[PDB]
Amino acid sequence: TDASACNKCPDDFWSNENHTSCIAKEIEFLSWTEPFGIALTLFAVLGIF
Amino acid sequence: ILWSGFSREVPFSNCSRDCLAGTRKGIIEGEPTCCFECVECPDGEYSDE
Ligand SMILES: *[C@@H]1O[C@H](CO)[C@@H](O)[C@H](O)[C@H]1NC(C)=O
Ligand SMILES: [Ca+2]
Protein backbone atom coordinates (compact mmCIF):
# COMPACT_ATOMS: atom_id res chain seq x y z
CA THR A 1 0.00 0.00 0.00
CA ASP A 2 0.93 3.67 -0.44
CA ALA A 3 3.07 2.77 -3.45
CA SER A 4 4.40 5.87 -5.21
CA ALA A 5 4.41 4.15 -8.60
CA CYS A 6 3.60 0.75 -10.09
CA ASN A 7 6.66 -1.44 -10.61
CA LYS A 8 7.33 -3.49 -13.73
CA CYS A 9 6.38 -7.16 -13.56
CA PRO A 10 9.02 -9.63 -14.84
CA ASP A 11 9.06 -10.45 -18.53
CA ASP A 12 7.68 -13.99 -18.30
CA PHE A 13 4.83 -12.95 -15.99
CA TRP A 14 1.78 -10.71 -16.39
CA SER A 15 -0.33 -8.71 -13.96
CA ASN A 16 -3.77 -9.90 -12.89
CA GLU A 17 -6.99 -7.87 -13.05
CA ASN A 18 -6.51 -6.24 -9.63
CA HIS A 19 -2.80 -5.51 -10.30
CA THR A 20 -1.90 -6.91 -6.87
CA SER A 21 0.44 -9.75 -7.85
CA CYS A 22 1.54 -10.68 -11.37
CA ILE A 23 1.38 -14.29 -12.55
CA ALA A 24 3.05 -16.03 -15.50
CA LYS A 25 1.84 -15.52 -18.99
CA GLU A 26 -0.33 -18.44 -19.83
CA ILE A 27 1.43 -20.94 -21.98
CA GLU A 28 -0.65 -21.98 -24.92
CA PHE A 29 -0.39 -24.77 -27.50
CA LEU A 30 -2.36 -27.72 -28.83
CA SER A 31 -1.97 -30.06 -25.87
CA TRP A 32 -2.19 -33.82 -26.26
CA THR A 33 -4.39 -33.93 -23.15
CA GLU A 34 -6.55 -31.03 -24.35
CA PRO A 35 -10.08 -32.13 -25.36
CA PHE A 36 -9.61 -30.80 -28.89
CA GLY A 37 -6.20 -32.45 -29.18
CA ILE A 38 -7.48 -35.73 -27.76
CA ALA A 39 -10.41 -35.65 -30.20
CA LEU A 40 -8.11 -35.02 -33.16
CA THR A 41 -5.72 -37.79 -32.12
CA LEU A 42 -8.65 -40.16 -31.60
CA PHE A 43 -9.87 -39.35 -35.11
CA ALA A 44 -6.39 -39.97 -36.52
CA VAL A 45 -6.05 -43.27 -34.64
CA LEU A 46 -9.49 -44.43 -35.78
CA GLY A 47 -8.62 -43.52 -39.36
CA ILE A 48 -5.33 -45.42 -39.15
CA PHE A 49 -7.28 -48.42 -37.86
CA ILE B 1 18.50 43.08 -15.64
CA LEU B 2 21.97 41.53 -15.61
CA TRP B 3 21.03 38.32 -13.86
CA SER B 4 24.28 37.25 -12.18
CA GLY B 5 25.78 40.67 -12.90
CA PHE B 6 26.82 39.54 -16.39
CA SER B 7 24.18 37.23 -17.90
CA ARG B 8 20.89 38.03 -19.64
CA GLU B 9 18.81 34.84 -19.20
CA VAL B 10 16.40 34.01 -16.37
CA PRO B 11 17.96 31.23 -14.26
CA PHE B 12 16.19 27.90 -13.85
CA SER B 13 15.26 27.36 -10.19
CA ASN B 14 12.72 24.54 -10.31
CA CYS B 15 13.20 21.33 -8.34
CA SER B 16 12.57 19.12 -11.39
CA ARG B 17 12.43 19.81 -15.11
CA ASP B 18 8.99 20.15 -16.68
CA CYS B 19 7.49 16.86 -17.82
CA LEU B 20 6.93 16.48 -21.55
CA ALA B 21 3.57 16.05 -23.28
CA GLY B 22 3.85 12.27 -23.43
CA THR B 23 4.73 11.96 -19.73
CA ARG B 24 2.96 12.65 -16.45
CA LYS B 25 4.16 13.81 -13.05
CA GLY B 26 4.99 11.10 -10.53
CA ILE B 27 5.60 11.69 -6.85
CA ILE B 28 8.81 10.99 -4.95
CA GLU B 29 8.38 9.82 -1.36
CA GLY B 30 9.65 12.36 1.14
CA GLU B 31 9.85 15.22 -1.36
CA PRO B 32 7.55 18.25 -1.77
CA THR B 33 5.09 18.70 -4.63
CA CYS B 34 7.58 20.81 -6.60
CA CYS B 35 9.75 17.68 -7.03
CA PHE B 36 8.26 14.96 -9.23
CA GLU B 37 9.10 12.31 -11.81
CA CYS B 38 8.22 12.05 -15.51
CA VAL B 39 6.50 8.67 -15.75
CA GLU B 40 5.33 7.99 -19.30
CA CYS B 41 1.62 7.70 -19.99
CA PRO B 42 0.38 4.10 -20.39
CA ASP B 43 -0.92 2.77 -23.68
CA GLY B 44 -4.34 4.07 -24.67
CA GLU B 45 -3.88 7.32 -22.72
CA TYR B 46 -2.62 10.70 -23.90
CA SER B 47 -1.62 14.07 -22.48
CA ASP B 48 -1.51 17.30 -24.48
CA GLU B 49 -0.36 19.84 -21.88
C1 LIG C 1 -7.93 -9.26 -7.10
O2 LIG C 1 -7.63 -10.25 -8.04
C3 LIG C 1 -6.50 -11.03 -7.64
C4 LIG C 1 -6.34 -12.12 -8.68
O5 LIG C 1 -5.19 -12.92 -8.43
C6 LIG C 1 -6.68 -11.58 -6.23
O7 LIG C 1 -5.69 -11.01 -5.37
C8 LIG C 1 -8.08 -11.33 -5.66
O9 LIG C 1 -9.00 -12.25 -6.24
C10 LIG C 1 -8.58 -9.90 -5.88
N11 LIG C 1 -8.42 -9.09 -4.68
C12 LIG C 1 -7.25 -8.68 -4.17
C13 LIG C 1 -7.34 -7.86 -2.92
O14 LIG C 1 -6.18 -8.95 -4.70
CA1 LIG D 1 11.35 15.22 3.35
Question: Residues of B annotated as binding site for Ca(2+)?
Answer: 30
Ligand nearest to the CA of A19: 1
Q: What is the resolution of this structure in A?
A: 3.1
H/E stretch holding A35: helix A35-48
- Which residues 6+ apart lie within 8 Å of A26 measured at CB? none
Burial of residue A3, with CB atoms counted within 10 A of its CB: 0-12 exposed, 13-18 middle, 19 or more buried: exposed
| φ, ψ of residue A36 in degrees (nearest 5) | -65, -45
Cβ A4–B28 below 8 Å, yes or no? yes
Question: Could you give the CA distance from residue B1 to residue A17 in angstroms, rounded to a whole number?
Answer: 57
Question: Could you give the CA distance from residue A37 to residue A32 in angstroms, rounded to a whole number?
Answer: 5
- Which residues 6+ apart lie within 8 Å of B36 measured at CB? B15, B16, B19, B25, B26, B27, B28
